[PDB]
Design a binder for this molecule. Sequence first.
Ligand SMILES: Cc1cc(/N=N/c2cc(S(=O)(=O)O)c(C)cc2C)c(N)cc1O
Length: 121
Amino acid sequence: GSHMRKKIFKPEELRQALMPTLEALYRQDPESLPFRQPVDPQLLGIPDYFDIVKNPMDLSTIKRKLDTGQYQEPWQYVDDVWLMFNNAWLYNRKTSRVYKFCSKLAEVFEQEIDPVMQSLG
Ligand SMILES: Cc1cc(/N=N/c2cc(S(=O)(=O)O)c(C)cc2C)c(N)cc1O
């Protein structure tokens, strides 16, 4: 639950650590919304979102990839939450809204995932 055997775990152990970090992202107010849910480039009015981003990811797809077993390693998810944060940071460039949403999330996230990555690492 903090440090014992080899790093690599089961997506379940992960969730135990990771998910909580997610819920923290999820609890970051609408700042989370654009991630805890698929951007839906049709819903928001983006026809080329996947032309700006190469890997959009969404805490929905992440916490699901988390609830499905697509990590097997906590970092896997991390790259994905940093993914959705990265594409929000590149898509909206800077001085936007989701840039702010992604900023604090990266904060709580590193406030969760750091303690996570250490609980797992
Ligand atoms: C990529 C992008 C996304 C944007 N908004 N996204 C969302 C907005 C809302 S909300 O209804 O306004 O709260 C919700 C729930 C979810 C999302 C994903 C946006 N405004 C500009 C953008 O360039």
